[PDB]
Amino acid sequence: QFGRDIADTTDAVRDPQTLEILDITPCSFGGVSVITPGTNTSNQVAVLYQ
Amino acid sequence: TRTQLPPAYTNSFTRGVYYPDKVFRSSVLHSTQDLFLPFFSNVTWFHAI
Known part of the structure; x- marks a missing residue:
């Protein structure tokens, strides 16, 4: 249900109920x-913004 | 009582590797400290033929 990337951070959590x-x-x-x-x-x- | 065969000693070839966590990883290396099977290890072989 969890997933990371190259940055070794959690930013793609899978919904256990919706499965999306x-x-x-x-x-x-x-x-x-x-x-x-x-x-x-x-x-x-x-x-001015960034 | 019945006859029996002497146990043998086999050798594993890179076996006993599972997922230490339930986190999806792709194109990224990860190292952790968990129970696993060493490579080229000699274990006791039991027969039953």
């Missing part, structure tokens, strides 16, 4: 960047 091969794909990864072209000549910014 499902993969694990989290959505909590990345970072938040800020772009500010100075503070004396500009006041607007822009949110």
Whole structure:
């Protein structure tokens, strides 16, 4: 019912009731960047993602 | 009472290998410490013909 990969981590658990091969794909990864072209000549910014 | 034959000593050729865990693995090597049968081991052979 379990399965790993090259990373030696558990990310493909098999459902014992449904018997359907499902993969694990989290959505909590990345970072938040800020772009500010100075503070004396500009006041607007822009949110940057990863 | 009945007659009997002397036991013999055979030799295994890479036998006694099972799955140590219930985890699906593919294209990845894994090593663990579990009970297994050594290679080219001499065990007691029992006859019954």
